[PDB]
Each structure stands twice: as structure tokens, then as C-alpha cells.
């Protein structure tokens, strides 16, 4: 028996909109402490891990650890049928045959109840070692999205150069090169993700822009994005969901042979 109730159901809509263009099917290992997801991209180039904690729901209830294999495309298609003010509840019986999504409207008039066919799926889970990274930059989500979108039209690879002074994003292609530099803003307050660069060692690596633009689909999810990185290790892009939890994207650097 599993039943979870989230009042501000917009978070779930945005999560699936963030994950629909990378993964087609993914296993939701529904435990008792919350909901987790861990998978790699359809191209074995990036890693997505979503975490929502049971404490963050308005009515969470689980009796046995379950593993729902869901086609994220179908889930997102179903979730588009809900308004941004509904109360969304997930439900799964003991036998994990079908998953139920229930949308309650703020007015009791509209109530939608869909049920999608599940699949069995073995989880090749990759344990990600938690180390301390050289650079950790905390910046606006929308600003990062603008950076990635703008640089996509120049070349196909971005060079992030975290430094003590500021952070620089560069790219180069057939039509020339471009590079943009950001600096820590004057400490106004906690004003809408002020750019804070916590540097431990200077860093510079290269990444592919396609998967970064895939990652930035989780922008409406948070107002702050955290880019954490070190040399020759996967870059971490963390979008924190309010209280509930977070969503992390791991991307491998671009080398040359």
C-alpha cells in the first residue's frame, strides 16, 4: 500500500517536464522515507537523480518498498491534464500492477483519476561518492539557462573556468568565439540567488552544451542553481525543490584524444 498527497502539485508537473526529454522509462523506487529516482540518459552520457522526501509531502504513507517502472513520456502526458493549482496524489496497491494519479481541484467540482500501466524493471543503480568539490557556484537559475541558450548558437562545447575572482563561460564555433564573465554581486542580501562562488582550488573544464540545455529544463523548479565541480570528475547541477528535496544532474567532462 502506497499513497502520497501533495497539495502544491505543480512541483510534480515541473519535475516530469524536466525529466521527459532525457529519460523515456525510469524506475521510481518508492520507499518509506520518500521517493527516489536514479537513471542515466538515453545516450549514456549524463546521470539524473531525483529525491523527494516523505516529510515534504502533505500525506505520505508507504507500507512496503516498491519499484514502479514508468514511461516518463506517458506520465508527463498524463500530468499535463492537471492544472497548476490541483492537489495531486499518487497511489499504488500491494501488487504493483498499475499506478494511479488523482488530481483534486481547488474547487471540489473537478476531480481527475488516471491509471497508467506499469512495467517491471531491474535497477542498475550507480553509487555516486559524496566528495568535497573544488568549486561550488550558486547562481540564478534563469541566468544559467540564458547563458546556456546563448552559448548554444556559437559552438557545441562550453568551457567553464571557475576562479577566485569570477566565473567565465566560453564557446567557439565556425562563426567565431564568445566568452562571458560573471562576478560576485555586492552582498545586497539573499536576493534571488545572488552569485556566490565558493572556491577551494581554481578549475577549468569543458562540457557538451546539448546535455546542459537538457538539464536546464528544471529551471522553473527552483530559483537558485548550484554548479559544483572538480577536475576530471562529473559536474553536478543541483536544483533544490523547496523543503521536499532536490534534483541532481551529473555530466562527464569533454576531453580530447
Amino acid at each position: 500500500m502506497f499513497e502520497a498527497r501533495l497539495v502544491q502539485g505543480s512541483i510534480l508537473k515541473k519535475v516530469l517536464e524536466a525529466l521527459k526529454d532525457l529519460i523515456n522509462e525510469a524506475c521510481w523506487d518508492i520507499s518509506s522515507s520518500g521517493v527516489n529516482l536514479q537513471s542515466m540518459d538515453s545516450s549514456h552520457v549524463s546521470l539524473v537523480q531525483l529525491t523527494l522526501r516523505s516529510e515534504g509531502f502533505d500525506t505520505y504513507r508507504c507500507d512496503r518498498n516498491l519499484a514502479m517502472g514508468v514511461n516518463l513520456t506517458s506520465m508527463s502526458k498524463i500530468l499535463k491534464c492537471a492544472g497548476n493549482e490541483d492537489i495531486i496524489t499518487l497511489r499504488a496497491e500491494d501488487n504493483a500492477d498499475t499506478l494511479a494519479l488523482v488530481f483534486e481541484a481547488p474547487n471540489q467540482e473537478k476531480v481527475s483519476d488516471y491509471e497508467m500501466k506499469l512495467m517491471d524493471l531491474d535497477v542498475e543503480q550507480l553509487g555516486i561518492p559524496e566528495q568535497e568539490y573544488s568549486c561550488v557556484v550558486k547562481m540564478p537559475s534563469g541566468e544559467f539557462a540564458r547563458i546556456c541558450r546563448d552559448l548554444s548558437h556559437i559552438g557545441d562545447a562550453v568551457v567553464i573556468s571557475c576562479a577566485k575572482d569570477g566565473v567565465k563561460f566560453s564557446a567557439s564555433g565556425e562563426l567565431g568565439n564568445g566568452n562571458i564573465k560573471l562576478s560576485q554581486t555586492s552582498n545586497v542580501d539573499k536576493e534571488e540567488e545572488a552569485v556566490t562562488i565558493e572556491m577551494n582550488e581554481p578549475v577549468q573544464l569543458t562540457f557538451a552544451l546539448r546535455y546542459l540545455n537538457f538539464f536546464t529544463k528544471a529551471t522553473p523548479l527552483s530559483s537558485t542553481v548550484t554548479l559544483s565541480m572538480s577536475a576530471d570528475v562529473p559536474l553536478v547541477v543541483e536544483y533544490k525543490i523547496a523543503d521536499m528535496g532536490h534534483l541532481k544532474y551529473y555530466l562527464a567532462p569533454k576531453i580530447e584524444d
Binding site: M40, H44, V45, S46, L47, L126, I128, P129, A208, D232, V233, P234, Y250, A252, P253, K254, I255
Partner: peptide, 8 residues
Amino acid sequence: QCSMTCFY
């Protein structure tokens, strides 16, 4: 372009 799973 490196890869994922070699970390460690």
C-alpha cells in the same frame, strides 16, 4: 567526451 560509472 569521457563517460559515466568510472568514479570510484
